[PDB]
Structure 1
Amino acid sequence: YGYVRKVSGPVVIADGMNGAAMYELVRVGHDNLIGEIIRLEGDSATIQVYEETAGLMVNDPVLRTHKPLSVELGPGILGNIFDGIQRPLKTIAIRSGDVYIPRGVSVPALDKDTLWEFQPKKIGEGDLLTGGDLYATVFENSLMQHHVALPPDAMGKVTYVAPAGQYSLKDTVLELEFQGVKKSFTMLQAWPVRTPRPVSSKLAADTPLLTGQRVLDALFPSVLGGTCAIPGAFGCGKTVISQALSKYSNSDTVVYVGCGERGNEMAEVLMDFPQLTMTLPDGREESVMKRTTLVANTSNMPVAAREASIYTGITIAEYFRDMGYNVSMMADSTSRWAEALREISGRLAEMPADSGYPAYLAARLASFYERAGKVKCLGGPERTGSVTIVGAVSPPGGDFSDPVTSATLSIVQVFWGLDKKLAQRKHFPSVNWLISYSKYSTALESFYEQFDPDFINIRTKAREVLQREDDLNEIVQLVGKDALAEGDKITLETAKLLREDYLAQNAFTPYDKFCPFYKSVWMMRNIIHFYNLANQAVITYTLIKHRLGDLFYRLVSQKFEDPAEGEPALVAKFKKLHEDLTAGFRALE
């Protein structure tokens, strides 16, 4: 019930919708075009329709949905591929057979006829349960067990519990009554993208995001449930860091979110993920897709879907965190999302602000980024998850002055700063140490000292060495290495060794594909301790340089060792090398 009255491009006016609500999604026309309500002036409505509105007919029916832009969560959310508006691309392609996306597809987000193995918890048929209680878990696939949380805003004494067995989402797995009225819940939960997910308490982040790369792990650490920023426009560093996060990061899940980038780039990345495979610490070999969800909205996709992809991804990440899993979101191109928002604002004729973006761009970016953090779960049993966002930025020409870049730098705690200059100089990590920073180091210092009380001092010494590296750089630039003192020469040599041996990774090489934090810490110790032990001896720089050739080779090889030997063997080898270097530095003095 409801018929269109005026169709001016994307904007659509439909009469007979007195009961419509603002921002309630609606189905327009026989083709089931999907659009969101904007203005409810009079008894009429106003809808902007995402897909092309060409060919609409006046008095074509309009069908309400009684729900805002929402995502159907539950089993089967992992692995698949979804559009910006939560449209399963893979199943759409299989059903329609052809390649083109049909104008008005109506495939449900998750297949409601597929069977998943279900088994309840030890709860009783007449017990009491509340919102967020974990009443069952499901083996969606191997090694990615999926907990079934009773939806929030739903509570009451238990009435029926489905016994363990094979079931589908259409089955009524749960039924309960709060008052005399009883409600039955399936395995599918719908939640609006704009509304965040209910939380019990925002904890303080207390565990680093071990990305497997030494430069990010030690120099500029990032904590679980913490924002991150990447100036990714070239050098494939964004692809490299995304692959590292998918394969080696501590997160139990990853939710890539791609909006408004080049279509072939998304093709390349979405073909790269299935090829990516990660080995289990127990020796098993798995596929990253078994723990990966992908929301990709190319430029050809409607602008509104491009804007909504980010919120869809963050809501998916929050739902994953609802069962205490550590999940990491990855916004492919926030600049593209901002451009989509700008286009939408221009469609709405909103008053332009700085550089043309709407005045709420900073506010909306902050609202999105504020959802990341380590959070106590809702409902029992007690557990805690985390959601960390590693959303990248694409400043125009590298000038960190655009409002998107400025707001992101103002909100994001940790900025890693990939540099194209290092990429030109053949640097695999490509992380510019001169601009990167980790504002969460003060909070992470508790764990840093618990693991090793000397590690934080080593990090401070390394930061001082990096600061003096540029000083020695202009020193050599203006007068040359001749004017450098023995201590200055030792400091410069140690800085160069750190840059070319530990601060840089080798990625492609099997020995340096993954850098454990243990190996990173031992390498940092074997570098800094040797640097000091050589420093206080000032001894002729040439003499120590000649007599430390074996020590220099050991320091260089302190990163060539493969992780095959494991932590106990590599740690012992690094300790022996450090002791030998200390003996050589002290005895020869």
Structure 2
Amino acid sequence: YGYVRKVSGPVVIADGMNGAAMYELVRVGHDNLIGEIIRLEGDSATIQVYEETAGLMVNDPVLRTHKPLSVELGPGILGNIFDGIQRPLKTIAIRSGDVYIPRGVSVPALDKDTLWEFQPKKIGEGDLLTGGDLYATVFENSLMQHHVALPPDAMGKVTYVAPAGQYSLKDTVLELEFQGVKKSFTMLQAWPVRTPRPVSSKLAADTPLLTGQRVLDALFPSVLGGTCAIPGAFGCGKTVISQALSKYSNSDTVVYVGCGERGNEMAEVLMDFPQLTMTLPDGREESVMKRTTLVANTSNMPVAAREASIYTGITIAEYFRDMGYNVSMMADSTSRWAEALREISGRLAEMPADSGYPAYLAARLASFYERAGKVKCLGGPERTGSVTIVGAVSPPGGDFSDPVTSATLSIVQVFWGLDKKLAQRKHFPSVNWLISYSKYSTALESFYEQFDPDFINIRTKAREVLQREDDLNEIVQLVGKDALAEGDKITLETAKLLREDYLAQNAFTPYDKFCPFYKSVWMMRNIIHFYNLANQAVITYTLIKHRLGDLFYRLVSQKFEDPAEGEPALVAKFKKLHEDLTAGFRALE
């Protein structure tokens, strides 16, 4: 009920919705086009239809939905491919047969006809429950056993618990009665994209993300729930780091939100991710897509869907966190989201603030980044999840003066600062150790101390060595390496070795494809010990360069030492190399 009255491009004004709420999705016309309610002037409303508005005829019925923009969560969310407006692209292609996305597709986000093996918990049938309780668990797949939980903001006395059996999503398995009424609950549930998932208490981040690359893991640690920004726009290095995170990182699952990027890049991602596979500690091979939910939005897609795709992905990540799993969310291009925001702002005619961006860009961006952190879950049993965002910055022109870049830098904790110059310098990691900074170093105090008490001192010395190296570069360019003091010359040589072997991880070779924390820490310890015991020894620079060349070769062999040779074996080899370097440096002097 409700008929269109003024259809002017994207905006459609329809009478009859006296009871429509602000920001409530509504279906327009026979084609069931989807639009949001903005202005509720009088008895009429205002619908910004996301899809094309051509062909609409006046008095075409408008159907209210009684729900803001919401994503249907639950089992089976993983693996599939979804658009910005939560549309399952693969099932749409299968059912429709045709290649194009039809104008007015109504395929549900999750196929409710598929059967999942539902296994209930031992909770009593006459017990009492509240929001967030892990009342059951469903085996949506392998490696991602879906710990279904009672919907948040729902508390009641349970009446009936379904047994362990194969059930559909449409089938109901739960019912509760706090008051006189009893309301049944299904496995599928919904949540608005905007409002964050309820959380009992945000927690201080304590444990780091292991990216599998030595440079990020060692120099600039990132906590669980720590925001990270990548300045990547060309060369697909950001996609490389995303693939590394998907394959090796600590994230129990990963969500990649690709919005507003070129269609070819999206196609490349959609073929590349299935090819990748993640090795278990058991060693048998399991595909990453089974643990990965991918959301893609091309430029052809409607702008509003592109803007809301970010909140869709972050809400999926929030569901996973509330399910008690550490999860990482990767934004392909925050700058593309900013472009979508400026387009929407121009469509709605807001007052520009800085370079065309709407004023509220800072607030929306800050909110989205702030929706990620280590969290104490709602309900019981008490478990802790974490959402860490590695959203990528893609400044146009490579200038930090871009308002989105400045806002992100103000908000982001860790900025890994990938540089195209390092790629031009034949560096595979391409991580600029200088322009990048870590703000979570203090957070790693307990973890680093437990793992290795001297690791903090090693990291500080490495940072000091990098600073001394960047100074000594221009110092050498001034007069030459010879004019430098013997200890300064050793420092420069050790910094060069550090950059060549430790900092630069090829990741193309099988031995360097994954660098564990133990191997990286041991390599750093060997390098720092060699540098130290060489610096005290001076004896001459050239003389010790020749007589300690074996020590340098042994230190470089730490890079040759790999987890592929075995973690205990790699640790033993690193210890032996450190001892050999110590003996060579001490005995010679």
Could you report, residue by residue, the CA deviation over 1:336-371 in whole angstroms, capped at 9, with x for unpaired residues? 000000000000100011111000001100011001
Could you report, residue by residue, the CA deviation over 1:71-107 in whole angstroms, capped at 9, with x for unpaired residues? 0000110000000000000000000011000000000
Query: How far 1:564 moved relative to its partner?
Result: 2.2
Q: TM-score, normalised to structure 1's length? A: 0.99
Query: How far 1:143 moved relative to its partner?
Result: 1.8
Distance in 1 of aligned mates of 2:569 and 2:478: 46
Q: Percent identity?
A: 100
Could you report, residue by residue, the CA deviation over 1:424-480 in whole angstroms, capped at 9, with x for unpaired residues? 011000000111111000111221111111000000000000000011101110101
Distance in 2 of aligned mates of 1:408 and 1:288: 29
Distance in 1 of aligned mates of 2:408 and 2:564: 39
Distance in 2 of aligned mates of 1:284 and 1:223: 28
Matched-pair contact (CA < 8 Å) for 1:112–1:170: yes
- 3-state secondary structure, aligned to 1:257: strand
Matched-pair contact (CA < 8 Å) for 1:211–1:249: yes
Query: How far 1:567 moved relative to its partner?
Result: 1.7
- 3-state secondary structure, aligned to 1:67: coil
Distance in 2 of aligned mates of 1:488 and 1:148: 60
Distance in 2 of aligned mates of 1:401 and 1:3: 47
- 3-state secondary structure, aligned to 1:158: strand
Distance in 1 of aligned mates of 2:141 and 2:236: 31
Matched-pair contact (CA < 8 Å) for 2:22–2:37: yes
Distance in 2 of aligned mates of 1:396 and 1:152: 41
Matched-pair contact (CA < 8 Å) for 2:317–2:328: yes
Matched-pair contact (CA < 8 Å) for 1:321–1:387: yes
Consecutive unaligned residues in structure 2, runs of 5 or more: none
Matched-pair contact (CA < 8 Å) for 2:231–2:394: yes
Consecutive unaligned residues in structure 1, runs of 5 or more: none
- 3-state secondary structure, aligned to 2:294: strand
Q: Aligned-residue CA RMSD in angstroms? A: 0.6
- 3-state secondary structure, aligned to 1:259: strand
Distance in 2 of aligned mates of 1:507 and 1:98: 40
Distance in 1 of aligned mates of 2:336 and 2:83: 15
Distance in 2 of aligned mates of 1:445 and 1:426: 34
Could you report, residue by residue, the CA deviation over 1:535-583 in whole angstroms, capped at 9, with x for unpaired residues? 0111201111101121111111211123123221111110111011001
Matched-pair contact (CA < 8 Å) for 1:51–1:103: yes
Matched-pair contact (CA < 8 Å) for 1:486–1:539: no
Query: How far 1:283 moved relative to its partner?
Result: 1.7
Matched-pair contact (CA < 8 Å) for 2:323–2:385: yes
Query: How far 1:236 moved relative to its partner?
Result: 2.0
Query: How far 1:396 moved relative to its partner?
Result: 1.9
- 3-state secondary structure, aligned to 1:229: strand
Distance in 2 of aligned mates of 1:529 and 1:137: 50
Partner residue, 2:385: 385
Could you report, residue by residue, the CA deviation over 1:352-403 in whole angstroms, capped at 9, with x for unpaired residues? 1111100000110001100110000100001100000000001122110110
Q: Report matched runs for 1:310-389 at 5 Å.
A: 310-389=310-389
Matched-pair contact (CA < 8 Å) for 2:561–2:574: no
Distance in 2 of aligned mates of 1:174 and 1:23: 30
Q: TM-score, normalised to structure 2's length? A: 0.99
Query: How far 1:235 moved relative to its partner?
Result: 2.5
Distance in 2 of aligned mates of 1:104 and 1:548: 73
Distance in 2 of aligned mates of 1:489 and 1:409: 36
Matched-pair contact (CA < 8 Å) for 2:156–2:176: yes
Distance in 2 of aligned mates of 1:290 and 1:138: 15
Q: Report matched runs for 1:51-66 at 5 Å.
A: 51-66=51-66
Matched-pair contact (CA < 8 Å) for 1:422–1:430: yes
Distance in 2 of aligned mates of 1:482 and 1:132: 67
Distance in 2 of aligned mates of 1:345 and 1:143: 42
Matched-pair contact (CA < 8 Å) for 1:155–1:178: yes
Partner residue, 1:552: 552
Distance in 1 of aligned mates of 2:562 and 2:465: 27
Distance in 2 of aligned mates of 1:544 and 1:565: 31
- 3-state secondary structure, aligned to 2:314: helix
Matched-pair contact (CA < 8 Å) for 1:258–1:295: yes
Matched-pair contact (CA < 8 Å) for 1:87–1:109: yes
Task: Tell me which moved more, 564-573 or 84-93.
Answer: 564-573
Query: How far 1:60 moved relative to its partner?
Result: 0.4
Could you report, residue by residue, the CA deviation over 1:19-55 in whole angstroms, capped at 9, with x for unpaired residues? 1000000000000000000000010000100001000
Could you report, residue by residue, the CA deviation over 1:173-205 in whole angstroms, capped at 9, with x for unpaired residues? 101101110000001110000000000000000
Could you report, residue by residue, the CA deviation over 1:285-326 in whole angstroms, capped at 9, with x for unpaired residues? 100001000011110000000000000000000000011100
Query: How far 1:586 moved relative to its partner?
Result: 0.6
Partner residue, 1:535: 535
